[PDB]
Every structure is written in C-alpha cells, then in structure tokens.
Amino acid sequence: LNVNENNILREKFENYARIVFQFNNSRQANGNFDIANEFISILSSANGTRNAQLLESWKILESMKSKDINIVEVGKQYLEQQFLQYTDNLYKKNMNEGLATNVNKIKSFIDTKLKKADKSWKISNLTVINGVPIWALIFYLLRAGLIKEALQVLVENKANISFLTYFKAYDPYRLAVYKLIGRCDLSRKNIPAVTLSIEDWLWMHLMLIKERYSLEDFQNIIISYGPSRFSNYYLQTLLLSGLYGLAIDYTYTFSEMDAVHLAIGLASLKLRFANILANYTKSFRYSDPRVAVEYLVLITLNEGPTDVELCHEALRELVLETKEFTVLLGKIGRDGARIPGVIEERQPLLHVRDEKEFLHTITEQAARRADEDGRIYDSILLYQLAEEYDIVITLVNSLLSDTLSASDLDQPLVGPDDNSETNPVLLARRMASIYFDNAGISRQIHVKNKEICMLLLNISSIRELYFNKQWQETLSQMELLDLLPFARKKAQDFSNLDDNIVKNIPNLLIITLSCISNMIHILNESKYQSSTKGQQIDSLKNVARQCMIYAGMIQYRMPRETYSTLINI
Numbered sequence: 001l002n003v004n005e006n007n008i009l010r011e012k013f014e015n016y017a018r019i020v021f022q023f024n025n026s027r028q029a030n031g032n033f034d035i036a037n038e039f040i041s042i043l044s045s046a047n048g049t050r051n052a053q054l055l056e057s058w059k060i061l062e063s064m065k066s067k068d069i070n071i072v073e074v075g076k077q078y079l080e081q082q083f084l085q086y087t088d089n090l091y092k093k094n095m096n097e098g099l100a101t102n103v104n105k106i107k108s109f110i111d112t113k114l115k116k117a118d119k120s121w122k123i124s125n126l127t128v129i130n131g132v133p134i135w136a137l138i139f140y141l142l143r144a145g146l147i148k149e150a151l152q153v154l155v156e157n158k159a160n161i162s163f164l165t166y167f168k169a170y171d172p173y174r175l176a177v178y179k180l181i182g183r184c185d186l187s188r189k190n191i192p193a194v195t196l197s198i199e200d201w202l203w204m205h206l207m208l209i210k211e212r213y214s215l216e217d218f219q220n221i222i223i224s225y226g227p228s229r230f231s232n233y234y235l236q237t238l239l240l241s242g243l244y245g246l247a248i249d250y251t252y253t254f255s256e257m258d259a260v261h262l263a264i265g266l267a268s269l270k271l272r273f274a275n276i277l278a279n280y281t282k283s284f285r286y287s288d289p290r291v292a293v294e295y296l297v298l299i300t301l302n303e304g305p306t307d308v309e310l311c312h313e314a315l316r317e318l319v320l321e322t323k324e325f326t327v328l329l330g331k332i333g334r335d336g337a338r339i340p341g342v343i344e345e346r347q348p349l350l351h352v353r354d355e356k357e358f359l360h361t362i363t364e365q366a367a368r369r370a371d372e373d374g375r376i377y378d379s380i381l382l383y384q385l386a387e388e389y390d391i392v393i394t395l396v397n398s399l400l401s402d403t404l405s406a407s408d409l410d411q412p413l414v415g416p417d418d419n420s421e422t423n424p425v426l427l428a429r430r431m432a433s434i435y436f437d438n439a440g441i442s443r444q445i446h447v448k449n450k451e452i453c454m455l456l457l458n459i460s461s462i463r464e465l466y467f468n469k470q471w472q473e474t475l476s477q478m479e480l481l482d483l484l485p486f487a488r489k490k491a492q493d494f495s496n497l498d499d500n501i502v503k504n505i506p507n508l509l510i511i512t513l514s515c516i517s518n519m520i521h522i523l524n525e526s527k528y529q530s531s532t533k534g535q536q537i538d539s540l541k542n543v544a545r546q547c548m549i550y551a552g553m554i555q556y557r558m559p560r561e562t563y564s565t566l567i568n569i
C-alpha cells in the first residue's frame with residue numbers, strides 16, 4: 001500500500017488521519033471521544049460491499065464500548081438489537097408507521113416471512129391460535145432479546161397447550177425454543193428450518209454456549225469453515241465470536257488502511273499493534289512526518305513498559321531517517337524560546353521518564369550526526385534547540401566567513417527570495433539579534449566568537465554598500481573595522497587573526513582599493529568644486545599606498561589570482 005499512489009486513496013488517508021488526530025487530542029485532554037462513532041460517520045456515506053461490511057463492524061465495536069467485557073453476552077445483545085432494528089425498517093416500509101409496539105412489529109414480520117402469499121403457511125406443522133404461530137412468535141421475541149414479552153405470550157396461551165415453569169426461571173419453532181432454553185441436544189447444534197440468515201446462526205450458537213459447548217468450540221467451527229461459508233458476513237462473524245486478531249488479518253486482505261484503523265479501535269477497547277502502526281507509516285512517513293507522529297503516538301495506547309520503548313524507538317527512527325527537524329523537534333523564535341515541534345506537543349502521551357531529557361537527548365544526538373555528515377544548516381538548527389549557544393556562533397562564523405570569501409563582489413549577498421533559514425547573512429543576523437541582545441544567552445558565548453560574528457556582520461553590511469556603489473560610506477565602515485591600515489604592525493598581526501577573518505581580508509583590500517579608485521575619479525571631475533579637493537585625493541592615496549605595502553607583506557597568504565587583480569588597480 002502507498003497512500004500517495006492516487007488521489008482516491010490519498011483522500012481516505014487524510015480523512016482517517018484527522019480522526020486519529022482528534023483521538024490523540026481526547027486522550028491528551030483526558031476527555032470524551034467515540035472513535036467508532038467517527039468512522040461510522042465517515043463510512044455511512046461510503047459505498048460498496050466492503051464498505052457496507054466495514055460500517056457494520058464499526059457498529060459492532062461501537063455497541064461494545066464501556067460495557068462489561070463478555071464476548072458471548074455482547075454478541076447476543078448485538079444480534080438481538082440488530083434484528084429488532086431490522087424488523088423496524090420492515091414495518092416502516094410495509095405499514096409505513098414507526099410507532100407500533102415491539103410485539104406488533106414482530107408479528108408483522110412473522111406474518112410476511114411465514115406466508116407464501118397464498119395466505120398459506122410456508123412451514124407445515126405450526127401450532128396456531130387466532131391465526132398466529134405462538135412458537136414462531138415466542139422464538140422471534142427471544143431472537144429480539146424480548147424475554148419479558150416472550151414469557152407473556154407463553155403465559156397467555158398456557159391452556160391451549162411445564163416448559164413454562166423452566167422458562168420463567170430463564171413444531172419446528174417449538175423445537176428451537178426448547179432447545180435454546182433447555183440448552184439440550186447439543187450434539188445437534190443446527191435446526192435449519194427456522195434459521196433464515198447468518199445472523200440467526202451466530203445468535204443460535206451464542207445462545208447455546210457453556211452438555212458442554214464453549215466459545216473456543218464456537219470459534220473452532222467458524223475458523224474451520226472459513227470465509228468461504230460466510231459470504232459477506234465473515235468480518236462481523238470474526239468480531240462477534242471475538243476472533244479479533246483474525247478480524248484484522250481478514251480486513252488486511254481487502255484494505256490495509258481499514259485494517260490499521262479497526263486495530264486502533266479494538267486497541268482503544270483493550271482487546272503487533274506497534275508493528276501495525278509502524279508499517280502503515282512507511283508510505284506517508286516522508287511526505288507527512290506530522291501524520292506519522294500521530295499514528296506512532298497511538299502505540300502507547302497500551303501502557304506496558306515494553307511498547308512505550310517501541311514508541312520512542314519508532315520516533316527516534318522517524319527523526320533520524322526523515323530529518324524533518326523543524327517540524328518534529330521544533331524551532332527557536334525571536335524571543336529565544338523554543339517553539340515546540342509535533343513530538344513535544346504529544347509528550348504527555350509519550351510516557352517519558354524525564355520531560356526535559358527525552359527531546360534533549362534525541363536533539364543532541366541528531367546534532368553530532370549532522371556535523372559529522374557535513375549538514376551545516378541542520379547542525380546550526382539542532383545546536384540551537386540544544387541551547388548550545390557558543391557552538392552555534394562558531395558554526396555560523398564558519399558558514400558566513402565561507403559565503404563572503406566565496407561569493408563574487410559583483411553579486412548581491414542577499415536576494416528577494418532569500419530567508420534566515422537558507423541565507424548565511426540572514427541567518428547570522430537572526431542569531432545575533434536573538435542571542436547578543438539577550439544577556440542570559442550572550443554570557444554563554446565566548447566574547448571572541450561574539451566579536452568575530454559582529455565583524456562578519458559588519459563586513460556583510462560593507463559588502464551591500466559596495467555593491468550599490470556607495471564608495472565613501474563603504475570606506476568609513478571599512479575603516480571602523482580596525483583590520484586594514486588606514487601597516488607593518490597589522491601585517492605582523494595578520495598571523496594572529498582568527499582563521500575566519502583572514503580569508504576575508506583579500507576581498508576587503510579589493511573593496512577598499514576599488515572604492516578609493518572610484519572616489520578619486522569623482523574628485524577629479526571638473527564639476528567637482530571643493531576647496532579641500534586636493535587634501536582628500538592625497539588622503540585617499542595614502543590609504544591605498546599603505547594597503548599596498550600591507551598587501552605585499554601578506555601576498556602569499558591569498559591566492560595569486562586575487563593579489564594580481566588587486567595590484568592591477
């Protein structure tokens with residue numbers, strides 16, 4: 001199965017996921033939720049053989065919630081209720097009413113199912129009174145769960161006739177009633193003339209159970225005959241007999257998705273689950289990591305210490321293999337506070353040993369994995385969530401330093417599409433503004449790292465000035481850097497510069513020298529009237545001259561290629 005194979009299957013996935021979503025919400029708010037009711041709602045509008053079969057299975061589960069656990073009593077209750085409802089629909093069709101007594105809905109039923117049209121009884125040897133078959137009536141009252149009424153009918157006709165003595169304690173139809181009430185002749189479980197449907201058969205057996213006829217015996221018979229002999233009522237049969245594992249199996253044969261969700265239903269009723277959910281996750285795990293988390297969180301539906309470990313393990317393998325860190329593990333907001341990911345939202349349901357250490361451990365681990373894989377952006381994101389502030393600055397300083405030295409001066413550092421997640425300049429600005437102005441966080445950062453970062457930000461500002469041809473403002477910003485000789489002293493210090501700064505100096509010199517060439521040209525124009533024209537030129541030529549000697553002393557510590565474009569300027 002693959003939930004993304006087509007749009008017909010994809011929609012069903014979304015509808016079911018929303019249900020599971022609301023279920024986790026109830027579990028967590030410790031509130032009221034009726035999952036069976038939910039699917040019943042979604043399936044009642046569906047159409048087909050299997051869908052009609054699934055809709056009824058959910059009704060079976062629904063009619064079973066919050067009830068004393070008793071497979072046989074619950075199967076009887078269900079089948080009896082269902083027959084009653086069935087006789088209702090028949091009355092509301094034949095007599096078009098809806099307000100007749102139970103007893104009358106049933107005589108109306110008995111009357112239209114035991115006559116050949118001929119006003120001739122279809123089954124010979126019926127004991128009759130006032131034109132109505134007392135044992136047939138008595139049987140279908142039982143069959144409807146209406147023991148009070150069945151007893152009344154027996155009492156009334158007492159005389160036209162002490163099985164009645166035993167009945168109070170507890171023709172073919174007369175044979176059935178004695179057999180069911182007496183629970184006699186168990187060797188002959190079947191009395192077919194009065195069995196007109198599969199529902200009737202299952203109910204007959206359930207009646208008979210625990211001279212000795214056990215549920216396990218009933219189940220054996222069912223399994224023995226297999227799906228072959230239950231037409232389109234095998235799932236119901238499986239659930240009614242309490243063969244829950246086999247019900248799921250069977251549902252897998254025509255619909256993996258419905259099987260998963262039926263299993264969620266039985267589980268929520270407390271009756272390979274982790275594996276059922278982990279497997280169903282496989283196809284939408286990468287395209288919908290939030291839905292994956294929702295289904296895996298169901299694993300703790302059972303509170304055993306064993307399957308809580310299965311849940312954490314599955315969640316670990318989700319984050320490691322999908323690397324949807326932001327969604328799963330969260331992200332840091334501009335106030336410095338973590339904005340929870342999906343796993344942190346469902347943490348109550350996770351039954352963790354330590355609220356804070358569970359996510360921290362996964363995060364720290366994924367972090368060491370990211371910097372070993374060379375995933376720089378992942379690393380930065382993860383070390384933020386780890387609150388490893390200093391490592392974050394170090395990694396940003398490298399990333400930003402590398403972007404500056406490797407980009408061309410002619411090309412803008414930052415486009416209109418760029419964001420703090422993908423652009424090193426934008427990213428670094430975001431980190432500075434979240435961490436440097438936050439005293440609690442800044443103290444955790446090494447003053448030198450913070451220095452380098454500010455420098456790299458200043459340099460990125462200088463770069464945008466330079467690109468927009470703001471020569472003079474570039475120069476005065478360049479001068480505040482305290483890096484270039486506005487000489488010999490600083491070339492000697494060149495060896496003590498941070499490794500991140502030194503790869504930026506060659507471009508700094510090319511910007512500096514090129515702003516000077518441009519200003520000088522502007523100052524030489526005729527239109528340029530200033531009384532200090534000449535002292536400005538000279539002063540610019542001084543800076544250029546000192547950068548040149550500086551440049552020459554450090555010439556083999558930048559590519560010849562750049563030292564050459566710098567000399568020829």
Ligand SMILES: [Cl-]
Pocket residue numbers: 404405459463504507508
């Ligand atoms: Cl640069």
